[PDB]
Symmetry: C4
Subunit: 388 residues, 4 copies
């Protein structure tokens, strides 16, 4: 009934409480579940949904052969309430795409599915199901967006789309949609920044996004912008390196990509800035995508220290992990006066790691809570391989 | 809450954006999906549904043996939201029939399922589930309707039903239903016109329908009628032949069926008239039903030229295609002031082409959008045959 | 929002139009469908549902072994919208029982599931899910009710429950429930009447029910009662014998059971009285339950003639049939001023007839319609046996 | 629309009527059903749901190997309407936990899922899906709650959480939540009381809970508390011993745990106090968890007699049983002026008893009803083992 308003700070967060695990892949052992990847959560006022880029096939099937590759005319974005296995039975259709992002402005959903050829892909802006606008690749190299939730404030929604090479320098645009209508955009001038798959969240008029450098950064690049899109960038000061792969935590930088041989690649991640401090979600292995923890250098957003301030384990480094996102839960839903930060973790299974013919993922998600919390490990839990 | 009103022109269309693909058949590889064929989309104010003539069985089953033939006491029309696999779980029942058409007048659905013996079939008019009227075959040779969406304007809905031989001359009626009540009908006087499986859409008081000549036309027959049903017919002037099979594009006619040896048969198709121009959806092969593109002779509706004005590829001619429809999205849904034309393509799989014991189809759908667009190929994607 | 009112005559009925077929069993070939039997339809103002007595198992399963017998602590009554396969996915729970009846008073559903031991069974009155009342067997021999829809008028609902031997004389009660509360009941004094599994329908203050004599009647016993329950009985005058088994149509009686060797048994059936005439639904075989047609002696309700007045075939006698019911569609739903009579036919498959380890059923349903109609045969369509 | 109010007595109960059986496990024979355990019902004003602690896998699957053990990062609490098989298709997600309790305050649901390591588990308070509060283990030994429904009165909800050894003395807290916000708590001082898995219900300002002594009680411990939490404890006076295992009914105590060699263990149970009398639900075997009946010593709550006053059989001791719960149905739903007591019985299948690699459970539930009733046996009904 009412729109998500602006001007609200990320509530106090002492520990992450488990919101929901979905055993997607475990149920797919013998159930009718979609082969997935690239999942992420997003809430509106009443319903919180899990979105995902379907490989257009179900687990334990001959059509799941090769689900290791991203992009195909088959890849389709779809939603489902949190915690439930994403099956053709509860899965609602959202868009045709192999990369995308969706958010809500409160009472309605915005869906940005980017499908089409590598050479000249197209974003398709849908609002509550209806196509409302489009955007075509401008640099001609895999236009691609967040692969996570976008943020909306006062009728207006924001996101970020990259387009360039994975190799080195690419190009970045900030959109400002309103009812699915692209009402403006700015070309970000970030020399030496590889920006892509951003994990955003609103923070008082502003919109803060921590993303990934898949060019030469072992730390994360960030970007905070206006209602008009006047930006501000750099990387996360902290030495508790978030990317992956990443080197042993050294002294970090706050404006350049810390290479250290490992920077060269990366994986989607998030982070919440709390003043001078910042909560950092990161994998435990430094070479592979396994395990997952939520750090806490309180000097983190401004200091290059490597000294952290406390860790809550989420997945021991004995199990697999993957894409880490970061949606938010507004104060229109919560009787509260501050936005609640929450995050979900994708546990990838199958290739290129495990000896299977398929590659999909599971998921879990925790929230803010300024109460008590315990750590652990809530992995996928699939006994692999399958009836392959 | 409000009725679909009349007097609205097909919005400006620069390129077709992908609305939704459903991997129906791919999910049926191991999922619980209905063996289908004859699908088509249709929207109302809130929900857009996909309708289809079920073979009364599920894919990869012994009861899917022979799904190649149309018509049976088993064939049943059913709906489901767009993009989702049409399974016994999300599929809603609509009518008993092996041919039909359904539309909305805005707040409610109209369903016309025609079932019964070849010799004396019956149409059954249901409105929001309730039987409201009926119509029996009058010429005694497979009464059959659109096999696509019908159009409604100002409480009143319109459709077209054929009844005659596939061989040559058949007979055609224009209905005018209101709340499922057949409030009038006209016998179309079209000497030398094989009219059937019409793809309609509203265009300002009027109702334009491009159909198929399965008698001796390699081009498409059309028909525009009133609120009172005073019609106007002929074929599409353009030389960019729409039927299939069809001969190489020669100089076309605008009132007679261009035979050229191939005319003899055909397949359902659509087309949107934009003044002197017209958007033409057609298969790439000329002998088989494979591939699919959306043409654009701007002189097309009035000129017999074969010179076209631009092509957006939808399915390379390397994959299968099939029935091509053409629903519309009114301006009551879209805040806009003009109806948005959209179309769906059926990709048929199995017989009579492929070495299987079954025959079903998948689907995709794109919309207007006066923005940018890219072409490609979004085929079914089923690795055939099956566990047959 | 409004209650089903009384005082309305069964609309004019020229022919039966097909409302819905569900290929229950055909989809169960490989789908997740419930092993059923004893189905029947029932509508309320918005939704029409199909109810059924589940064998507490799914088709093609080892737990479907013996589904030939009625009654078990497993048998559970459940609903689902018309036309859809009754699967654990769309099937809504209704009650624990191996015999029952449910109806609506317009805005709410009444459910009467009778479960428990043969010796001392209990009816359980639930209204919109909540238990509201109960009734225990009074004669101690399988208390059992309609096994079809009951009728409600002006806040009040009515049904019929038998209790006695199948062998000969049993006992019958007429209930009068209101919001699931049994507000009165009468003991029917029908010497020489075997009354059970009644197919009812409202007809102007009154409630007419045609049932079955499984004692010594080859024709059907009827019963019309008041708002206070003052009854009137006898059998259907007509010579077009409805029971099954039944002898060749001879001259019938209107108050006694016509034995003729075959009377001894029977199967549920229905019939609609239209003044002096009456529509009769009956099987084609006289020894088995196969085929199904809808007769029409217009002198039928009062005359003992065997001369009929027209037949619409529903299922050739080459396929199986079974329980035949008879719900109604009120005028609160239909803008009309008269109730619309409709009926559903159960096609039983498996034992004791076919060489299977299971026994379930499918269904179809047609309605009034004072328009044109065609006959045919819309059988189950299952290729048996199964993966048994 | 309106909150569940307080001050209402458990309506008169002559016999238990069957509300719903779900053949969970039987449908899982070949259906897509969740491997479950720890189920229990809970109603709100409109919908009654069944909740359960999923083993994060489906029956007849390799991932159901070991479902015999409680607790795992996979165990997740989920709901579904009563009577339906708890499958990934109708099962709604509720929380991440291997122990929990949920209730309604009328218009909304409260969910308390306790997940995490044995050493330091955490309760997570969610209200209508949103995390609203948390509580961490305080004694560091499997914090665990009711494993059944909690009670809410006048905006406020109540429950009970244990934390200590199964061996002997543990510790107990009474919570008082309001909109998921823990607004107070009391540490129960029960020397010599093993309190856990309480079966509660409201009874006029007060909240009565009968639980289980898994330390040295063969009878059940109880606890009645205020709006402020001023408690009162002891055990059930009656000699008709409720725990299990339990010794032959001797003369009972009303404040201490009756050991008798068997007390040492136990299984969840319930009981409703009706003045000086009390309805007792208990297993028939004394060593195993098989069969189930509902006793009635009318002198029971105050007298140590072993003389009972009537038994209604629920499951002969030839079949398996398990956890027995006890939710309630308020008078806001029932037009009535008194709360209706109802109970559900879990029939466990598989290990440690049966020769299977899995362990799950089915369920049934009956209600108050001051009418007639019959006894019987409505067991799971699964033919074991499975395709194991
Ligand atoms: C649009 C697209 O292909 N995104 C892909 C992304 C991308 O290649 C990289 O960020 C360089 O731009 O990488 C990965 C990956 O984790 O292997 C999966 C994504 O689907
Ligand atoms: C009612 C009916 O049978 N329609 C059929 C239609 C028809 O035969 C033809 O248009 C000549 O009238 O052809 C085809 C077809 O593409 O093979 C499938 C349809 O189901
Ligand atoms: C309650 C019950 O068992 N009803 C059964 C009914 C009954 O035995 C008969 O009407 C004599 O009373 O017969 C049949 C039947 O068609 O074989 C199935 C029913 O389930
Ligand atoms: C949190 C937890 O593990 N609860 C378990 C409970 C518990 O161990 C016992 O009550 C001693 O505290 O016992 C049992 C059981 O019937 O075998 C299953 C429960 O899941």
């Amino acid at each position: 009934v009412i729109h998500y308003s602006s001007g609200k700070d990320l509530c106090p967060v002492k520990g992450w409480a488990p919101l929901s695990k979905d055993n997607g892949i475990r149920i797919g052992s013998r159930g009718e579940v979609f082969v997935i990847r690239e999942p992420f959560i997003s809430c509106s006022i009443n319903e919180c949904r899990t979105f995902f880029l379907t490989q257009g096939a179900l687990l334990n099937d001959k059509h799941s052969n090769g689900t290791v590759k991203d992009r195909s005319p088959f890849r389709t974005l779809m939603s489902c309430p949190i915690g439930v296995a994403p099956s053709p039975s509860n899965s609602r259709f959202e868009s045709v795409a192999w990369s995308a992002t969706a958010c809500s402005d409160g009472p309605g959903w915005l869906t940005i599915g980017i499908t089409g050829p590598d050479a000249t892909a197209v974003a398709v802006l849908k609002y509550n199901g209806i196509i409302t606008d489009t955007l075509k690749s401008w640099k001609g190299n895999i236009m691609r967006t967040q692969e996570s939730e976008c943020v909306c404030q006062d009728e207006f929604c924001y996101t970020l789309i990259t387009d360039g090479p994975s190799d080195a320098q690419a190009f970045y645009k900030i959109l400002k949609i309103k009812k699915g209508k692209i009402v403006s955009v700015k070309d970000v001038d970030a020399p030496g920044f590889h920006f892509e798959e951003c994990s955003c969240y609103p923070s008082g008029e502003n919109v803060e996004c921590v993303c990934r450098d898949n060019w030469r950064g072992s730390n994360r690049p960030w970007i905070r912008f206006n209602s008009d899109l006047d930006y501000q960038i750099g990387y996360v000061c902290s030495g508790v390196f978030g990317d992956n792969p990443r080197p042993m935590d050294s002294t970090g930088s706050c404006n350049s990509p810390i290479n250290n041989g490992k920077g060269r690649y990366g994986v989607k991640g998030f982070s919440f800035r709390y003043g001078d401090g910042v909560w950092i979600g990161r994998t435990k292995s430094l070479e592979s995508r396994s395990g997952f923890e939520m750090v806490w250098d309180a000097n983190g957003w401004v200091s290059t220290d490597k000294d952290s301030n406390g860790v809550q384990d989420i997945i021991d480094n004995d199990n697999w992990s993957g894409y880490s996102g970061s949606f938010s839960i507004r104060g229109e839903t919560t009787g509260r006066n501050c936005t609640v930060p929450c995050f979900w973790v994708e546990m990838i299974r199958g290739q290129p790691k495990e000896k299977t013919i398929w590659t999909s993922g599971s998921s879990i998600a925790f929230c803010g809570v300024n109460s008590d919390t315990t750590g652990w490990s809530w992995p996928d839990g699939a006994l692999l391989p399958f009836d392959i």
